[PDB]
Amino acid sequence: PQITLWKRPLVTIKIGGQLKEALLDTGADDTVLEEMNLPGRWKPKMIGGIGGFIKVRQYDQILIEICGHKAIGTVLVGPTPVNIIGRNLLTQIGCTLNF
Amino acid sequence: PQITLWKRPLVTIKIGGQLKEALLDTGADDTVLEEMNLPGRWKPKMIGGIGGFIKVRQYDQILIEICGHKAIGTVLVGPTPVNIIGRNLLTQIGCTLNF
Ligand SMILES: CC(C)C(NC(=O)[C@H](C)NC(=O)OCc1ccccc1)C(=O)N[C@@H](Cc1ccccc1)[C@@H](O)[C@H](O)[C@H](Cc1ccccc1)NC(=O)[C@@H](NC(=O)[C@H](C)NC(=O)OCc1ccccc1)C(C)C
Ligand SMILES: O=C(O)c1ccc2c(CN3CCOCC3)c[nH]c2c1
After folding, report:
1. Where in the cell is it found (chains A, B) (predicted)?
2. Which residues of A touch B94 (CB under 8 A)?
3. Which CATH entry fits the domain spanning A1-99: 3.30.200.20, 3.50.50.60, 3.40.640.10, 2.40.70.10?
């Protein structure tokens, strides 16, 4: 699709059989989910943002379907009020910015 | 312009007759720039991101050009690590996501 930005660009995603929604976020290097139970052991990892820095949980090789497009990569579990799809997955679905 | 997302979607902007660089950020509701003097009155405002909240100065009706597209709107100024163009100005330049 072609998504305008008058509201937040939330899209439906599918991850481990569950439907969730998430934000297509060109300002995120990484993909970050709030709760999602991803299976097994995770690596600790730091990320930053406008407020400063926070510890999150890194899981690798995670399959998310985004609007029907399959993407496999790293997914962080962290304190975000919304699920965030970052550039690491946006690139794999062929997502571009256009004006 | 079509912009891919294998690296950060950084672009040249002009604001108060200065060239700067700033991140096209579809996950930001608002536009936040590094401290600079802008014309007219500001009001205090707080905004939230990763690692918490920061205090910014809000200016209204600021002219900004993004790759030669004029936009006029609200620009927040404060201790951001990166200049951010959010949805409030991305819609004005006709910026869309496409996959
Ligand atoms: C999600 C993060 C991984 C993302 N960070 C990155 O990609 C960073 C730079 N990469 C990174 O950490 O790489 C690893 C590394 C290791 C450490 C040192 C350096 C590098 C991020 O904070 N990116 C943001 C832009 C950014 C880029 C670089 C530096 C600083 C800011 C927005 O795209 C992204 O959309 C966030 C998502 C966000 C929303 C809400 C709170 C938590 C996360 N929006 C924002 O930070 C802004 N918020 C908003 O647009 C509206 C106002 N806020 C909001 O609704 O807040 C609600 C609220 C706040 C607090 C708690 C509860 C809810 C802001 C730019 C205006
Ligand atoms: O530039 C400043 O001197 C300045 C000083 C104070 C604030 C505040 C205080 N607030 C406003 C919103 O509610 C909570 C706290 C925000 N920006 C600010 C900027």
Report:
1. Host endosome, Host multivesicular body; Virion membrane
2. 99
3. 2.40.70.10
